[PDB]
Design a protein around this nucleic acid. Structure first.
Ligand SMILES: [Mg+2]
Ligand SMILES: [Mg+2]
Ligand SMILES: [Mg+2]
Length: 1278
RNA sequence: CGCAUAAAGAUGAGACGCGUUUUAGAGCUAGAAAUAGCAAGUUAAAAUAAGGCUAGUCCGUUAUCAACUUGAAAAAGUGGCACCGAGUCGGUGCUU
DNA sequence: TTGTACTGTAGCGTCTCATCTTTATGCGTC
DNA sequence: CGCTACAGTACAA
């Protein structure tokens, strides 16, 4: 009758179990549908549901942004062609048409095969004249001759298409501020521009050039002018010119030849040194090592020069290949020092070109347009249009430019015209769109869902924070006393401690708070420092306009928008002080609204709740009481302020990977309720990933990072805080925190970093994001940009480890970086990335599973109890119970119910059953702890330490004998009782045998969730041309036999077809039954009309009613109970579970972890002799694995290999042997076959690359719990 | 639940630099040639999920998804119990 | 001409802006 | 709180 359900929830598994009051799992005879002979099957009410973990929308967002970028770049090119078309039709009408067909082959082109000029000799002359596009760019910038319009279009389209970063907001003119000769009109900067640019080097070299008459006041070449509102005093012009000079000359090599195109000059310089070094290297290789010439300059697969140009070898790979060849030869000293500087044989389109700003291209484009405006009037007519096309960028607060058909757009448009960069200002309403950029994202108030929350830096919200912490301060404080302490302490100090309170108010004019007050009026002090009017802030009438000021400052960050919103209030303030106020940027919003805290008033008292916090007589209630006190009128107002399950999950925001676990466990609960005849359970047990730790441990794990930086710098004895002071709240920034963690020095290059130019530096992940998802502090490293651009899909190389291993140790012993961070940095010493590094759990699954279990508690408590009364707010029909994993782990570790995850997927169901058993025993044994453990209820040395001790000692009733902390045992009798009632709640007799029997049960309903695969169509790598037909066409008109294409298509689901295929030169319709893979591209076309799609594949007389959709992980059953999961249409997977007996599992868990039990020496000796007397269990386990493999795995050669390896190493110690048998279950583990390894030998997987046997097998349609099945025998079809 | 300090992650927008693919950048000589010697190599165009229609400088890899009967779809409905045992579940007995 | 066996292959590095979450500790609260 | 299908080449019929 009565029963309980226990659940274990992971990111890939949902374990479920049903128990009665006797801790027994029921078994039922379930009906079986389908055409098979079986009509009833006995199944136990215990199992687990396995599924692929849900994916976050990060990758989809990156692909979407890339798609938008490509679309807008093509639109920029289209705008430029639209401008140029009228004049281009005069000189070459087919020119843009030839540029469009440049991808096509000779037969597919509709014009001459030469794109630019349409004939061989002119194209050859053009390429001889300009080897690169940069030669043409420099020629158009510098020369004054009238050039061909096609070359002008080529240059302009080159800089428009590839336009450089927009991280610099100033002008940074390269026409005259480029050259370092600004010093003579300042009073060269060449010295530090050759050396390392840093404050100390600038100071010492400035003293070296000129012993200063004023150390901080030299008025020229100072670090203040190198590294707009600060001009209120009136060296400014020369200061900004020298700043632009030092920045541009850091980006680009110097150009003493005067030109307006420094970038093209630097690229031509790279080309010239590349040509010279190539010729010299060819001569030296031919003269010294003639045998290596063929390998280096012809073999393109050996990372040589042919591999550097024609092959896929990068610059780093080519350098590390060619360094031994260069060092073993003679006369290669300068080439060696160029290779050390990474300046040898460089290309132009390199990885480090991301540092180049868009202003250089803007200057070059402006120079070309100024040169060519006289000859071509239309260039001068719309020079501003071309400049706008190059320089326009959609603001991030506007978003996509949709017309109401995008689920991501929030833009509103004033008019209905098409948006171009020229008329973007007169069409798009930037103010409302900028408002909606923040309003669409900030959350609503929980108590008032209908209206938005306040900013955190609101003055009203800060008065809230103060009086809400203060109202429970006891020495209760009266309202006059609270007013006085606020006036004399909170309005006078940004941070107030209890000592300042004691020695400033109570001395002349405490429990409930610790050493410092959490509440402060930071915004009040900021406006005191800005406005310089305490009376204006203290006035009550101007509260709403101050709130509008805070809202305006928080919503907007652009200067023009802030000034546009701020112009209404300009007649109370002076122009200098709104100019100073508009610099105050606010980020962060509060947890409460304006109406809930100061708009609503009590019906009888008439006060706002903030007034209630200011003065509550002697009661001194806070918001929690004031919303849960029935006497005030706030509770029913909040209550008045307050259908498919898919809708109950559609409205819950957050990561989409929580929805998979939520939906699976709720549907499992629903089906389990349906199975037992619509009878609701007594209580439902939820695995909670929460814990309880010591107060000291929790405070150590939650201390300020500012203290960590202080101890690290003090251990290293650095003075970076003396030069660069900082607070704790300024370390919330990622880049500043990583700069301070590395003591202002770059981690990959031995140089001092610049604190004021962190935007040009990159946050590298030591383990690549392409390899494994890990955004921890142990992985993040701040470094200069070009090095991180070079570290594409790689751990930093061996050379930087040998260079800077001393500094890594220096920071490691300074307690600034952890041991894991050092191991990541020194990963290249151990072989770098490998398959073993790929394995192991990651913390993202932990965070997602915590979110999932919290939502499990909420949704299950909402769904299960759907009844209430007028006096009883909810009838607790079902009690949702959340135990912590520690209690179940201790239950496993104290009564020898060990689990290992390597053997089978039964551990999920066993953990769920143990959850149910422990939860029911705990609620039955202590009904006074019902309100503690059941969700929705509440009971109302450190407190956390006391809670940890109480949760540690609560399980002591399970044990037969309890050993106290003094080493003395205690007696607790075998049969437990409820205490208040003589009811039996735990027997240390029959119930332990029952739980042993359940944990040894062989049949557990393990179900792999069948999913239709969705995602990318194929792998992103575009493969070269070939005669194979497996190449996927990259476009409709692009035949992959000529143009190449993608490979490895992903199939959505497989389809069983029964039709005829014309086989033989004498055509005859032979009937055939086979699986066909429906790829993701063909999914829509197949579901549109399956018959015509199958007819186009060569089939005919297709039995339409016989088509069975077979998604991935579809289950088939064959002889001797052998089951294969359909991985794809051409691949199967292992689908059987090995039910090893519990004694063998306990023996394996005790044999492994041989000397790391950390229990007691008597227990360690007990396990010592226990594993010693039963060493024959290894042979029994090998026999069991061999029998299971011969029955179901059908990998005979690998079986002989593992048997020979076990026989040859049977004299090894028990630790290593048992560890390798733990590794051995990978052969028999359900899922894809994987390559495991024994002691020394490595066993390659046996792949099941044949789906012929499942065409005559028994297809199983398992439900969400697998109890309801529909077996289909496919041999009766066709 | 609010405030404060952690840590690990989510959602959305604007951008950059590469990479890949085909074509253009006349290869020369000895050559019956299979080939061999020599020369050259750095750049550009186009595409960057096939595409879709509400045609937007928009959207297209997230989430949802056992089988059967109704329903365009959404959605709804569909499967006996007790006992004795256990190699992926079996056997025995009542029930309509 | 069609199945099997063994080995290799797979898109990548950031920058600037916003807002959130669930766990851990110190205070009040139900 | 987990963890490969497809490509390409070489042999058996
Ligand atoms: Mg990186
Ligand atoms: Mg689990
Ligand atoms: Mg999906």
């Amino acid at each position: 009758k009565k029963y309980s359900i226990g659940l274990d929830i992971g990111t890939n598994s949902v374990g479920w179990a049903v128990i009665t009051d006797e801790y027994k799992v029921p078994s039922k005879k379930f009906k079986v549908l389908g055409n098979t002979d079986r009509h009833s099957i006995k199944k136990n009410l215990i199992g687990a549901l396995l599924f692929d973990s849900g994916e976050t929308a990060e990758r989809t967002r990156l692909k979407r942004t890339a798609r938008r970028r490509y679309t807008r770049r093509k639109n920029r090119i289209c705008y430029l062609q639209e401008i140029f078309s009228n004049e281009m039709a005069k000189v070459d009408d087919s020119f843009f048409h030839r540029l469009e067909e440049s991808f096509l082959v000779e037969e597919d082109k509709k014009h001459e095969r030469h794109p630019i000029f349409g004939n061989i000799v002119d194209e050859v002359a053009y390429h001889e004249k300009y080897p690169t596009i940069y030669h043409l760019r420099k020629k158009l910038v510098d020369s004054t001759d009238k050039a061909d319009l096609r070359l002008i279009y080529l240059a302009l389209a080159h800089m428009i298409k590839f336009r450089g970063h927009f991280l610099i907001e100033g002008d940074l003119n390269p026409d005259n501020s480029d050259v370092d000769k600004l010093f003579i009109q300042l009073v060269d900067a060449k010295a530090i521009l050759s050396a390392r640019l840093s404050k100390s080097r600038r100071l010492e070299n400035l003293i070296a050039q000129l012993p200063g008459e004023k150390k901080n006041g030299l008025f020229g070449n100072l670090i203040a002018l190198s590294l707009d509102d600060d001009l209120d005093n009136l060296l400014f012009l020369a200061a900004k010119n020298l700043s632009d000079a030092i920045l541009l000359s850091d980006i680009l090599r110097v150009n003493t030849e005067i030109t307006k195109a420094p970038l093209s000059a630097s690229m031509i310089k790279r080309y010239d040194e590349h040509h010279q070094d190539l010729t010299l290297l060819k001569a030296l290789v031919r003269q010294q090592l003639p045998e290596k010439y063929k390998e280096i300059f012809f073999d393109q697969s050996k990372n040589g020069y042919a591999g550097y140009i024609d092959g896929g070898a990068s610059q780093e790979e080519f350098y590390k290949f060619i360094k031994p060849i260069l060092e073993k030869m003679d006369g290669t000293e300068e080439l060696l020092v160029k290779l050390n500087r990474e300046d040898l044989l460089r290309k132009q389109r390199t990885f480090d070109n991301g540092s180049i700003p868009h202003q250089i291209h803007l200057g070059e484009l402006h120079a070309i347009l100024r040169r060519q405006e006289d000859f071509y009037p239309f260039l001068k007519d719309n020079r501003e249009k071309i400049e706008k096309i190059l320089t326009f960028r959609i603001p991030y607060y506007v978003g996509p430019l949709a017309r109401g058909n995008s689920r991501f757009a929030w833009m509103t448009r004033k008019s209905e015209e098409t948006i171009t960069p020229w008329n973007f200002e007169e069409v798009v309403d930037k103010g409302a769109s900028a408002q909606s950029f923040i309003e669409r994202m900030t959350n609503f108030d929980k108590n008032l869902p209908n209206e938005k929350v306040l900013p955190k830096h609101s003055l009203l919200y800060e008065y809230f924070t103060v009086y809400n912490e203060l109202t429970k301060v006891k020495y209760f404080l009266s309202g006059e006393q609270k007013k006085a302490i606020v006036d004399l302490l909170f309005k006078t100090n940004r941070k107030v401690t209890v000592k300042q309170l004691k020695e400033d108010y109570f001395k002349k004019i405490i429990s409930g708070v610790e050493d410092r007050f959490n509440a402060s009026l930071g915004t009040y002090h900021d406006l005191l420092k800005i406005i310089k009017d305490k009376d204006f802030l203290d006035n009550e009438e101007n509260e709403d306009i101050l709130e509008d000021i805070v809202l305006t400052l928080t919503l907007f960050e652009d200067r023009e928008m802030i000034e546009e919103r701020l112009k209404t209030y300009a007649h109370l303030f002076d122009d200098k002080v709104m100019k100073q106020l508009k610099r105050r940027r606010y980020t962060g919003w509060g947890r409460l609204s304006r109406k809930l805290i100061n708009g609503i008033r009590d019906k009888q008292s008439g006060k706002t709740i903030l007034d209630f916090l200011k003065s509550d007589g002697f009661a001194n209630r806070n918001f929690m009481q004031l919303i849960h006190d029935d006497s005030l009128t706030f509770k029913e107002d909040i209550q008045k302020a307050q259908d498919s399950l898919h809708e109950h999950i559609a409205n819950l925001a957050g990561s989409p990977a929580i929805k998979k676990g939520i939906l699976q466990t709720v549907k499992v609960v629903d089906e389990l309720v349906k199975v037992m005849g619509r009878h609701k359970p007594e209580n439902i047990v939820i695995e909670m990933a929460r814990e309880n730790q010591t107060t000291q441990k929790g405070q150590k794990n939650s201390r300020e990072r500012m203290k960590r930086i202080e101890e690290g710098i003090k251990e290293l004895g650095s003075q970076i805080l003396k030069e660069h002071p900082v607070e704790n709240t300024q370390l919330q920034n990622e880049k500043l925190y990583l700069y301070y963690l590395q003591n202002g020095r770059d981690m990959y290059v031995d140089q001092e970093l610049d604190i004021n130019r962190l935007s040009d530096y990159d946050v590298d992940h030591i383990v690549p994001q392409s390899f494994l998802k890990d955004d921890s502090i142990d992985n993040k490293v701040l470094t200069r940009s070009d090095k991180n651009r070079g570290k594409s899909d790689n751990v930093p190389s061996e050379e930087v480890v040998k260079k800077m291993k001393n500094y890594w140790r220096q920071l490691l012993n300074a307690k600034l970086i952890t041991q894991r961070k050092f191991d990541n940095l020194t990963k290249a010493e151990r072989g770098g990335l490998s398959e073993l590094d790929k394995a192991g759990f990651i913390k993202r699954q932990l965070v997602e599973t915590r979110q999932i279990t919290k939502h499990v508690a909420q949704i299950l408590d909402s769904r299960m109890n759907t009844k209430y009364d007028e006096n009883d707010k909810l009838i607790r029909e079902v009690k949702v119970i959340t135990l912590k994993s520690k209690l179940v782990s201790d239950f496993r570790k104290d009564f020898q119910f060990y689990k290992v995850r390597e053997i089978n997927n039964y551990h999920h169901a066993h953990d769920a059953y143990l959850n149910a058993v422990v939860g029911t025993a705990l609620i039955k044994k202590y009904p006074k702890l019902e309100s503690e453990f059941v969700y929705g209820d509440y009971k109302v040395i450190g407190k956390a330490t006391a809670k940890y001790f109480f949760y540690s000692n609560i399980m002591n009733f399970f044990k037969t004998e309890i050993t106290l902390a003094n080493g003395e045992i205690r007696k607790r009798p075998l049969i437990e009782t409820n205490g208040e009632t003589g009811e039996i709640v735990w027997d240390k007799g029959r119930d332990f045998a029952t739980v042993r029997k359940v944990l040894s049960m062989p049949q557990v309903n393990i179900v792999k969730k069948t999913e239709v695969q969705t995602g990318g169509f194929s792998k992103e790598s575009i493969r070269p041309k070939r005669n194979s037909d497996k190449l996927i066409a990259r476009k409709k008109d692009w035949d992959p036999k000529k143009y190449g294409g993608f490979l490895w298509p992903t199939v959505a689901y497989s389809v069983l077809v029964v039709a005829k295929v014309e086989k033989g030169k004498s055509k005859k319709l032979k009937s055939v039954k086979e699986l066909l893979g429906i790829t993701i591209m063909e999914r829509s076309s197949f579901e549109k009309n399956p018959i015509d799609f199958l007819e186009a594949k060569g089939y005919k007389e297709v039995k339409k009613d016989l088509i069975i959709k077979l998604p991935k992980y579809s289950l088939f059953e064959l002889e001797n109970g052998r089951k294969r999961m359909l991985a794809s249409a051409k691949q199967l997977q292992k689908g059987n579970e090995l039910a090893l007996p519990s004694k063998y599992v306990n023996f394996l868990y005790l044999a492994s972890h041989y000397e790391k039990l950390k229990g007691s020496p008597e227990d360690n000796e007990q396990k010592q002799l226990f594993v010693e007397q039963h060493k024959h269990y290894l042979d029994e386990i090998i026999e069991q694995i061999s029998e299971f493999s011969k029955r179901v795995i059908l990998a005979d050669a690998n079986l002989d290999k593992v048997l020979s390896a076990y026989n040859k190493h049977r004299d090894k110690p028990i630790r290593e042997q048992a560890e390798n048998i733990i590794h051995l279950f990978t052969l028999t583990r359900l899922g894809a076959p994987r390559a495991f390894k024994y002691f020394d030998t490595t066993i390659d997987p046996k792949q099941y690359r044949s789906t012929k046997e499942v065409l005559d097998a028994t297809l199983i349609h398992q439900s969400i719990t697998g109890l309801y099945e529909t077996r289909i025998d496919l041999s009766q079809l066709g």
